[PDB]
Design an enzyme around this catalytic site. Structure first.
Site, short mmCIF file in Angstrom:
data_model
loop_
_atom_site.label_atom_id
_atom_site.label_comp_id
_atom_site.label_asym_id
_atom_site.label_seq_id
_atom_site.Cartn_x
_atom_site.Cartn_y
_atom_site.Cartn_z
N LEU A 96 0.82 -1.22 0.00
CA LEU A 96 0.00 0.00 0.00
C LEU A 96 0.86 1.28 0.00
O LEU A 96 0.39 2.33 -0.44
CB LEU A 96 -0.99 0.01 1.17
CG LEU A 96 -2.03 -1.12 1.13
CD1 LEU A 96 -2.87 -1.00 2.39
CD2 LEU A 96 -2.90 -0.94 -0.09
N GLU A 138 5.00 -7.18 6.88
CA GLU A 138 4.63 -6.17 7.89
C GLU A 138 5.73 -5.94 8.90
O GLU A 138 5.95 -4.80 9.31
CB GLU A 138 3.35 -6.56 8.64
CG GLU A 138 2.16 -6.85 7.73
CD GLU A 138 1.74 -5.70 6.88
OE1 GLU A 138 2.15 -4.56 7.17
OE2 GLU A 138 1.00 -5.93 5.88
C1 LIG Z 1 1.74 -10.32 0.15
C2 LIG Z 1 2.48 -9.75 1.35
C3 LIG Z 1 2.07 -8.31 1.72
C4 LIG Z 1 0.58 -8.13 1.90
C5 LIG Z 1 0.22 -6.80 2.55
C6 LIG Z 1 0.07 -5.64 1.56
C7 LIG Z 1 -0.43 -4.41 2.31
C8 LIG Z 1 0.74 -3.66 2.90
O1 LIG Z 1 1.36 -2.82 2.25
N1 LIG Z 1 1.07 -3.95 4.16
O2 LIG Z 1 2.30 -3.39 4.59
C9 LIG Z 1 -1.00 -6.03 0.58
O3 LIG Z 1 -2.15 -6.13 0.94
N2 LIG Z 1 -0.58 -6.23 -0.66
C10 LIG Z 1 -1.42 -6.81 -1.69
C11 LIG Z 1 -0.71 -8.02 -2.24
O4 LIG Z 1 0.48 -7.93 -2.48
N3 LIG Z 1 -1.37 -9.17 -2.39
C12 LIG Z 1 -2.78 -9.44 -2.10
C13 LIG Z 1 -2.92 -10.95 -2.21
C14 LIG Z 1 -1.52 -11.51 -2.42
C15 LIG Z 1 -0.62 -10.35 -2.83
C16 LIG Z 1 -0.45 -10.28 -4.35
O5 LIG Z 1 0.21 -11.49 -4.79
C17 LIG Z 1 -1.62 -5.75 -2.78
C18 LIG Z 1 -2.40 -6.30 -3.97
C19 LIG Z 1 -2.29 -4.50 -2.23
CO LIG Z 2 3.43 -2.80 2.84
#
Ligand SMILES: CCCCC[C@H](CC(=O)NO)C(=O)N[C@H](C(=O)N1CCC[C@H]1CO)C(C)C
Ligand SMILES: [Co+2]
Length: 163
Positions: A96, A138
């Site tokens: 994010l 995180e």
């Molecule tokens: C995957 C490890 C990190 C997940 C947390 C992040 C959110 C974040 O920035 N936390 O610091 C997120 O939701 N990211 C999503 C993300 O990376 N995803 C969502 C499902 C799996 C993965 C994409 O492969 C995006 C799409 C906003």
């Molecule tokens: Co992040």
């Protein structure tokens, strides 16, 4: 309340967050606002530094089979510490705080952490796959680290390209 998410290249994101010592109404207010902000932004996790709060606390809520996030499945992870790490795994992540960019990051395949929940209760949690990756993403934020920092020579150029 909905909070503003801090984006790269803000130096705020390089802050080392500080331990939570008071598990009180203000902490719960902050955690509630983080949850609201994470869901409104369609994230599956959020670290407090991402909304400008340099505290060692993060939330994770992975969606169920119906693809939606149920609040009862949310983990509130405060003052976490790794106990065990194992294996390696690639996972495609976005953040994010780095919106629009996705790249494969090498993470531990399995982790075990100790932490406190919002009531100061000590927990031990083992995790693998997406939950383990989310935990690591995180916790990295609590240490001033963004997933783009973990990319290779090549994949970093792809980052500067898409920038
Ligand atoms: C995957 C490890 C990190 C997940 C947390 C992040 C959110 C974040 O920035 N936390 O610091 C997120 O939701 N990211 C999503 C993300 O990376 N995803 C969502 C499902 C799996 C993965 C994409 O492969 C995006 C799409 C906003
Ligand atoms: Co992040």
């Amino acid at each position: 309340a909905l909070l503003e998410i801090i984006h790269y290249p803000s130096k705020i994101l390089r802050t080392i967050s500080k331990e939570v010592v008071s598990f009180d109404a203000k902490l719960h207010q902050q955690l509630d606002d983080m949850y609201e902000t994470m869901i409104a932004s369609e994230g599956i996790g959020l670290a407090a530094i991402q909304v400008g709060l340099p505290l060692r606390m993060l939330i994770i809520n992975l969606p169920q089979e119906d693809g939606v996030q149920h609040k009862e499945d949310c983990l509130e992870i405060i003052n976490p510490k790794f106990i065990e790490t194992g294996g390696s795994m690639m996972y495609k992540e976005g953040c994010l705080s780095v919106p629009g960019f996705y790249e494969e990051v090498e993470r531990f395949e399995k982790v075990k952490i100790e932490y406190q929940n919002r009531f100061a209760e000590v927990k031990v949690l083992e995790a693998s796959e997406l939950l383990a990756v989310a935990i690591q993403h995180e916790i990295d934020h609590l240490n001033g680290v963004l997933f783009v920092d973990k990319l290779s020579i090549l994949k970093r150029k792809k980052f500067e390209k898409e920038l």
